[model samples]
Target: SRGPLRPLCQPINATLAAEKEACPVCITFTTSICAGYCPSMKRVLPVILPPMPQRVCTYHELRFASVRLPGCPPGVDPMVSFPVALSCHCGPCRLSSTDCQPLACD
Candidate 1:
């Protein structure tokens, strides 16, 4: 099966900045932590039928709403909170590990 399509500029890393205008939040994300922290995710169901197929999720879109602030930027503004995300579709598989292995890249 075709994996998730590549992005149109990879979603917004963060929102706009505050206090100072013409600025966006500053942050970066990496998938390294995901392997340790987010070992699993809630599985998704296909339909409301008599027997729901068994399924498991490996990884999904996760957002970190906070991080250590290294003081203000090179200006007098602050970040819009901030986000560090490793996003994935998390689905389209039978309820088994082997079937979902294609999602290993996340």
Candidate 2:
């Protein structure tokens, strides 16, 4: 004999899903009618850099920047350069945010 097993939550009705399915990102985010939808990202801190690299952002792309973090002092802050993405989260676990992470620069 067999039994049923499904770790379950509230189901997403067709009507509710339809209302929020305005964009592809929206659909990917709206899992269930009762699931909180927000970017799967968090406040992150960058690491130090080797040297400032001459880079450029494509028409619609951006990358980490390296600059002198003055007053932070090498001992206290160790003069770090975070080589992280300077754009919105765009993966399976991505989300939008009103509060954007600010780049440490002038």
- lDDT tens digits, residue span 1-106, model 2: 1221232222232121111112222111112122222222223443543222322121123333333333443344322232222232122322221112212112
Show pairs that collide, candidate 1: 54-95, 55-95
* TM-score, predicted candidate 2 vs. hidden true structure: 0.20
Error of 2 at 20 (Å): 39
Best by lDDT: 1
In candidate 2, the residue pairs with backbone N, CA or C atoms under 3 Å apart (3 or more residues apart, or in different chains) clash, namely: 39-95, 48-81
Give each model's clash number. 2, 2
